[PDB]
């Protein structure tokens, strides 16, 4: 016997609620699954709609309704309204609204310029591809008015794939399952992070180079601590807003470069005051700026 051809349509209303630490995101949408069963008799020989709690009564009476699992859903999805549409020719359409937490690999190392791929993976829970196979998949997403107010900028239409997953721990040709894969590409909106985080940080790090224009070893060294303290004061401003991650981002590296630059100046200032009154090396008012930008370009090689 041939497998049941199941046609799938996924409507995505919203993708939001990224949890950087857990690498998860929420997806609100509809899922539609259509297949052809045996013909049946319906009231007035017209399509029959069966909603929510009444679905259970048809299943208990024999109506085949396979469970399709979201491979990458975290916990049970929040399923709202759902209906069946039973045609007399045998066609069956299952339609349900869902809100689920979904996971996938997410790399935030180029924050705030990172680019992510939001994925949904769908697969029958119990029926292999000799019994149930996905014949096609179509995706429909939100028509965006303007994205300037949005946190993520969608890039391209939804990508789809239909593949076969072969499991080695189910022992003839009965260990392959049909899997749908949907992917939404998006880029982070960096405007806020550019103006309120990166820019003020550059000013703070640049302003620490002003110590070299002070005409007293006393002034230069003392003010270096006020700068060190300014980078720290800025540290918990970024830590309180930027996402929690198990690795360093771009901004983080800037912050670390800031710590070193100020700490370097402390050494040079002290080194200048005991090397020979070396106001010539104290004229490193250009070396320090140049050295930082050089190492700064190398930082963003990823």
């Amino acid at each position: 016997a041939r497998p049941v051809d199941v046609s799938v349509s996924i409507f995505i209303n919203k993708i939001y609620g990224v949890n950087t630490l857990e690498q998860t995101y929420k997806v609100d949408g509809y899922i539609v699954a259509q297949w052809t069963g045996k013909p049946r008799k319906t009231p007035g020989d017209k399509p029959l709609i069966v909603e929510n709690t009444q679905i259970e009564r048809w299943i208990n009476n024999g109506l085949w309704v396979p469970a399709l699992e979201f491979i990458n859903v975290v916990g049970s999805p929040d399923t709202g309204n759902k209906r069946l549409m039973l045609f007399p020719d045998g066609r069956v359409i299952y339609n349900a609204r869902f809100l689920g937490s979904f996971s996938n690999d997410m790399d935030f190392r180029l924050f705030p310029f990172d680019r992510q791929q939001f994925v949904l993976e769908l697969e029958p829970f119990s029926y292999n591809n000799q019994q149930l196979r996905f014949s096609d998949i179509q995706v429909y997403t939100e028509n965006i008015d303007n994205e300037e107010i949005d946190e993520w900028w969608i890039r391209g239409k939804a990508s789809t794939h239909i593949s076969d997953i072969r499991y080695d721990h189910l022992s003839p040709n009965q260990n392959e399952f049909s899997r749908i894969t949907v992917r939404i590409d998006a880029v982070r909106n960096p405007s806020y992070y550019l103006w309120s985080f990166i820019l003020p940080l550059g000013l703070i790090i640049a302003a620490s180079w002003s110590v070299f224009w002070l005409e007293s070893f006393s002034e230069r060294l003392q003010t270096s601590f006020t700068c060190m303290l300014t980078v720290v004061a800025y540290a918990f401003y970024t830590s309180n807003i930027l996402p929690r991650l198990p690795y360093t981002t771009v901004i983080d590296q800037m912050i670390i470069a800031g710590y070193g630059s100020i700490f370097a100046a402390i050494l040079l200032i002290i080194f200048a005051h005991h090397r020979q009154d070396d106001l010539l090396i104290q004229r490193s008012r250009l070396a320090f700026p140049l050295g930082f930008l050089a190492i700064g370009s190398v930082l963003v090689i990823r």
Epitope: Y140, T141, E142, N143, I144, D145, N146
Partner: nanobody, 124 residues
Framework: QVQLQESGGGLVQAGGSLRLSCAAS????????MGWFRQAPGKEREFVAT????????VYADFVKGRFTLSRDNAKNMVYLQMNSLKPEDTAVYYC?????????????????WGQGTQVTVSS
Amino acid sequence: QVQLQESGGGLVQAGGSLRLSCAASGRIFSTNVMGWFRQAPGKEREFVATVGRIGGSTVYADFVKGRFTLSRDNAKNMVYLQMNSLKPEDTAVYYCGARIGGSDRLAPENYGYWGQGTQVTVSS
């Protein structure tokens, strides 16, 4: 920013057909924000049609009853309103507007950059 120009309307007998076109030019990266409105003398400017939030959907006024169709051409920054089975009540000047903001595709308040309009007349 942008400017809108309607066209395609005229005189037609009850039951005929017309196809209105609206061309947009300026700072507009998508035709999703464009919407058709109509306003006959004596009544207030009422909504007709615009795109829906989810792809593949379209919002129509209750008086359309499936007779009008909103099509798109994102490449040419143009929208088209195919009006069929026209009634004498459809007589009005049909305006094309671009959505400024808010969050109500149906409210003209959220629309600006209106165009001159195209007169649509339907006799018996």
